[PDB]
């Protein structure tokens, strides 16, 4: 079976490279034939992900969570062991899971997966088992592009970011708020109900957990870098949750404006942060999901998000070490 590089309307190109790269089928197709081609074309696929940063596989027989798991298995990347610092996860089969995000009417900001975690995924997979009735795409953007445009537009700001970095403040409830963009409580965050084991697992993850009165918790993280270096592609990337926090960490316990600051406490310039948001939207690519679609994302080069949608919609995921 052949893996054909196919053009789609939404994709962009950077230095002659498509973003995202799109592979489609040209013996009747079957899941085993696909997973077999994946193993056979390992090198080709590694080079494609290396050049593009994300690869969308469209037109293949991935009709269930089990099929998706088999495809993830064919790529052979080591699975990311679950710890904490993420959201209420629900394992479906094997390395595949469903995480409960914010409501369909909301817009999930751009971010790198588990960006504030020490051992974050190098790669992730997204699978559409049930396409959204309307909207619900998973827009993606090249992190190094965002950095380059930011350094070009706001050299001083970028310069200050690499000197002082960023500081993150996030208040947590005891339980999980299904209605919040950042509704995970400290119980689910640290997979514990004991404050001792929590405050410890918290300090380990590199946090300053101070128990709140209403049984919640106020977490503070940083200073930590805002810019990182992709060793495999020799370039710097916008690896931070600045825009995500500044515009999305909003609920009864969190004021977005105070959710993230420069590493030295100094506030961020509202106009520059929103200018960054503008760059993310302009450079992003929002491919409408089709049932069977499997998207492979290199977490070092891409930030993802989610658009509002009308149910039904079901996108499963898988994280790689």
Residue list for the binding site for Fe cation:
111, 113, 304
Cis peptide before 312 (omega within 30 of 0): yes
Give me the least distance between CB of 315 and its own copies, in Å please: 13
Residue 183 or 222 having the CB closest to its own copies = 183
Pick the binder of its own copies from 144, 149, 160, 187 (CB under 8 A): 187
Residue 193 in the binding site for its own copies (CB under 8 A): yes
Residues in binding site? 111, 113, 304
Rule CB under 8 A: choose which of 100, 159, 232, 290 binds its own copies: 100
3-state secondary structure of 227: coil
Q: How far is the CB of 136 from its own copies (least distance, A)?
A: 17
Contact at 8 Å (CB) between 72 and 96? Answer: yes
In the complex, minimum distance from the CB of residue 227 to its own copies, in angstroms, rounded to a whole number: 35
Listed ranges 59-67, 110-118, 254-262, 285-293: which one lies at the site for its own copies (CB under 8 A): 59-67
135: left (phi over 0), alpha (psi -120 to 50) or beta: left
Question: Minimum CB separation from its own copies for residue 183, in Å?
Answer: 7
Nearer Cβ to its own copies (88/288): 88
Sign of CA dihedral 37, 43, 44, 50: positive
Name the residue nearer to its own copies (CB basis): 178 or 265: 178
Spatial contact of 226 and 232, defined as CB atoms under 8 Å apart: no
| Residues within window 113-142 making contact with its own copies, judged by CB under 8 A | 129
Stretch that binds its own copies, among 93-101, 105-113, 205-213, 225-233 (CB under 8 A): 93-101
- Residue 185 touches its own copies, criterion: CB under 8 A: yes
Binding of its own copies by 277 (CB under 8 A):
no
- Structure-token match 């040209």, residue found: 26
Per-residue 3-state assignment (H helix, E strand, C coil) for 249-290? CCECCECHHHCEEECCCCCCCHHHHHHHHHHHHHHCECCCCC
User: How many amino acids of this chain bind its own copies (CB under 8 A)?
Assistant: 25
Give yes or no for a contact between 259 and 246, defined as CB atoms under 8 angstroms apart: yes
- Judged by CB under 8 A, the residue of 98, 122, 200, 212 near its own copies is 98
Q: Which stretch binds its own copies (CB under 8 A): 64-72, 142-150, 151-159, 294-302?
A: 64-72
Name the minimum Å distance from CB 307 to its own copies.
21
Q: Of 41, 64, 200, 212, which lies in the binding site for its own copies, with binding defined by CB under 8 A?
A: 64
Cβ burial, residue 139 (10 Å; 0-12/13-18/19+): buried
Q: Under a CB-based contact definition with an 8 Å cutoff, are residues 317 and 97 in contact? A: yes
Per-residue DSSP letters for 8-54? -SS-EEETTEEESEEEE------HHHHHHHHHHTHHHHHHHHHHHSE
Question: Does 175 interact with its own copies (rule: CB under 8 A)?
Answer: yes
For residue 115, which of 49, 168, 76 has the smallest C-alpha distance? 168
Cα distances (angstroms) measured from residue 233 to each of 144, 230, 287: 10, 6, 25
66 part of the interface to its own copies, by CB under 8 A: yes
- Interface with its own copies includes 196 (CB under 8 A)? no
Residue 230 makes contact with its own copies by CB under 8 A:
no
With respect to its own copies, which residue has the nearer C-beta, 79 or 174? 174
Q: Number of C-alpha atoms within 13 angstroms, CB side, residue 119?
A: 11
The residues that touch its own copies, with contacts defined as CB under 8 A, are 64-67, 88, 90-94, 98, 100, 129, 173-179, 183, 185, 187-188, 193
């Amino acid at each position: 079976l052949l893996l054909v590089e196919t053009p789609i309307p939404q994709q962009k190109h950077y230095e002659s490279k498509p973003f995202p790269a799109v592979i489609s089928p040209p013996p009747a197709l079957s899941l085993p034939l696909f997973t077999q081609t994946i193993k056979t074309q390992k090198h080709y696929l590694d080079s494609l992900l290396h050049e593009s940063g994300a690869v969308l596989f469209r037109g293949f027989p991935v009709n269930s969570a089990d099929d998706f798991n088999d495809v993830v298995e064919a790529f052979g990347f080591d699975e990311l062991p679950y710890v904490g610092g993420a959201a209420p996860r629900t394992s479906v089969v094997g390395r595949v899971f469903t995480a409960n995000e914010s409501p369909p009417d909301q817009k999930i900001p751009f971010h790198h997966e588990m960006a504030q975690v020490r051992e974050f995924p190098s790669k992730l997979f997204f699978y559409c088992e049930i396409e959204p009735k309307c909207g619900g795409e998973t827009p993606i953007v090249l992190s190094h592009v965002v950095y380059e445009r930011m350094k070009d537009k706001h050299p001083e700001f970028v310069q200050r970011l690499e000197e002082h970095g960023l500081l993150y403040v996030r208040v947590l409830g005891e339980d999980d708020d299904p209605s919040s963009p950042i509704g995970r409580g400290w119980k689910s965050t640290f997979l514990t109900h004991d404050k001792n084991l929590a405050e410890q697992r918290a300090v380990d993850l590199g946090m300053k957990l101070e128990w709140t009165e209403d049984g919640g918790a106020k977490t503070v993280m940083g200073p930590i870098p805002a810019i990182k270096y992709d060793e495999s592609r020799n370039r710097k990337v916008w690896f931070n949750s600045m825009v995500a926090a500044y515009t999305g960490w909003e609920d009864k316990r969190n004021d977005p404006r105070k959710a993230v600051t420069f590493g030295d406490g100094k506030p961020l310039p509202a106009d520059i942060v929103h200018d960054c948001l503008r760059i993310l939207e302009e450079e992003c690519v929002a491919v409408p999901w089709q049932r069977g679609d499997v998207l492979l994302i290199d977490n070092w080069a891409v930030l993802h998000s989610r658009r509002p949608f009308d149910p039904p919609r079901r996108v499963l995921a898988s994280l790689c070490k």
